[PDB]
Amino acid sequence: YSEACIEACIDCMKACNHCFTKCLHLSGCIRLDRECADICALAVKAMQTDSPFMKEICALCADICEACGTECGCQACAKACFTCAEQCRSMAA
Amino acid sequence: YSEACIEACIDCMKACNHCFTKCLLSGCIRLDRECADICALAVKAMQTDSPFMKEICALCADICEACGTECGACAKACFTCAEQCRSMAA
Amino acid sequence: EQYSEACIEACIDCMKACNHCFTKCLEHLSGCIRLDRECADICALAVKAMQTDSPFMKEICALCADICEACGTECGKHDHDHCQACAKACFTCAEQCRSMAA
Amino acid sequence: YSEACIEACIDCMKACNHCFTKCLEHLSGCIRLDRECADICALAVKAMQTDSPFMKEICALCADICEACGTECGKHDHDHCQACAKACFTCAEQCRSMAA
């Protein structure tokens, strides 16, 4: 069941991309927002295509989401990031 | 606002990616890949408020229409996405 | 890559320049930063489209030219952080993409 | 520094994309992995060029996908598959160095 993780990724993308634009000492949040939005997209694609690397991609996505949430924590972004990390860890297990 | 179009793009991505894997039809496979890729780009454009959002959506609609025509579930999602993208692109 | 090798190269060069500019600008530049991200991303897509003989390659190249033209215009308003180099690479890429798109 | 790894990723993208189109004109596993590998190589390039804080982790992933793509394409003797395998294995080795 990947529907819930896909939704969390999509929500995280949205929040990270909005935070990126609004932010534009925020250089760290901007960098992470870009990388997080990019890895979330990759995780969505991996889950939608049934990729053999879906779990590894999800694990990476969690790590990036956690870092992005820590740095933005911007508060909406941090929340969506931590939720997405949790869902990606579950998928990765 | 863009939530409905984003949702249609995401549904189209899902359907095109599922069709790509199941087909693996060479025309459908090629278009499935391109359509999924342009849907993802349209999602990003809407989420980042890109100045090229309308142009990207227009392109996305064209590719979705072609993908739907060739695949014609995927076809259904494609035509839905095309119409939502045309509305955004106006 | 008989007909696309040059345009591919210009897109690869533009990606490099835009990504470099993005990072340097981050260390009044917010418009350049945004466009650098968009332009690097579309250039990567155009490369993929050309390499895979994708049926929308010409349309993708036309979009790439438009985004490159805009990125070049915005980066061209700044005189450090690799912005003038980025503008040049953008304009080169736009011209090559317009040829491919024909 | 990343120039050599970038170059290997760019070469691997080229080979995977070429292999994808040639295979489409028992190759379904190669076609799938060609798509994923070309895509991750593009991401690794961006990560290196933008000095992204997860560049090392992305390079590690890119190595794993490259190794799998090479292993699968390496089972076939036309459609640019052997060339694709070689470029995949080269890339993987450069990415592993960058990921350290």
Author numbering:
A (entry chain C): 4 to 27, 34 to 82, 89 to 108
B (entry chain D): 4 to 27, 35 to 82, 91 to 108
C (entry chain B): 2 to 28, 34 to 108
D (entry chain A): 4 to 28, 34 to 108
Task: Show me the paper's own sentences about this structure.
A cytosolic Csp3 is also present in Bacillus subtilis, whose metal ion homeostasis has been studied in detail. The 18 Cys residues, all originating from α-helices, point into the core of the four-helix bundle of an apo-MtCsp3 monomer and none are involved in disulfide bonds, consistent with the Bradford:DTNB ratio data above. The crystal structure of apo-BsCsp3 has also been determined and the protein is a four-helix bundle like that of apo-MtCsp3 (the α-helical content in the structure is ~81%, very similar to the value of 83.1 ± 2.5% (n = 3) obtained from far-UV CD measurements, Supplementary Fig. S5). Apo-BsCsp3 also forms a tetramer, but αN is missing and consequently the apparent molecular weight in solution (46.0 ± 1.8 kDa, n = 8) matches that expected (47.4 kDa). The 19 Cys residues, also all from α-helices, point into the core of the bundle of apo-BsCsp3, with evidence of partial disulfide bond formation only between Cys38 and Cys81 in the crystal. In both Csp3 structures three highly conserved His residues are found at the more solvent exposed end of the four helix bundle. His104, His108 and His110 (His104 and His110 are ligands) from the α3-loop-α4 region are found around the opening to the bundle in MtCsp3 and are highly conserved among Csp3s, corresponding to His84, His86 and His88 in BsCsp3. Leu51 of MtCsp3, which is conserved in BsCsp3 (Leu35), corresponds to Met48 in MtCsp1 and its hydrophobic side chain appears to partially block the entrance (a Met is actually found in this position in a number of Csp3s). Copper coordination in MtCsp3 largely involves sites with two Cys ligands, with the most novel being Cu13, which as well as having two coordinating thiolates is bound by the side chain amide oxygen of Asn58. This Asn is not highly conserved in Csp3s, and an Asp is more common, as found in BsCsp3. Treatment with DTT has no significant effect on thiol quantification demonstrating that the Cys residues of both apo-Csp3s are not readily susceptible to oxidation. The Cys residues all originate from α-helices and the four-helix bundle scaffold provides the rigidity required to hold these residues sufficiently far apart to prevent thiol groups coupling via oxidation (in a cell this will be assisted by the reducing environment of the cytosol).
